[PDB]
Amino acid sequence: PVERTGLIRGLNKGHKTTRRVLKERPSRRKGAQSKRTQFVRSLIREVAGLAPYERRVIELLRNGKDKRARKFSKKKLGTFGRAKRKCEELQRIIAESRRAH
């Protein structure tokens, strides 16, 4: 950790204390992928397939309309970041399909 300057204003302001590094709290471990979760999620993907709007975004990304796919994903999902994550996940899906074929 960066040592504080001991000032009331400016960069790194605050009273000087000896900072400690802590063991990572297990509550903050959420979001990490596990082997069981990864295997189950991949198998469930193979069992179930894709949504109709997911297939539409697949078609747009195969056709090369990346901005149109991002716009359609944002319209469907409601969030630009979620649209970007869905688009990159479908890039991974298309890449795996191409490397399989």
Partner: protein, 108 residues
Amino acid sequence: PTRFSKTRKHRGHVVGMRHFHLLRNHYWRPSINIDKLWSLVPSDVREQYLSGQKKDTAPVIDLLSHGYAKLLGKGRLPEIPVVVRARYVSAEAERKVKEAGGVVELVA
């Protein structure tokens, strides 16, 4: 009381910005002038300093311990060196401290 009222006597004869979610704790900085600076010292030791019986020792005053954040420079200081612990200080306050022979260093 009813008996003192006048009714008893009258018996028979009738801009700028909008700051959403303002937290006052952000802007907490009480200020103290240098003419009240020696008042923070207890009376006996302050009397000894103003009398002049201790020539080799200088007082250190923490404003945040007394509840003040900024040292202002209204008034004049005696010729006694005083170390002052402060978060903020004004330019002529610190200048009059330098004339008095002390120093103002910053704390947080």
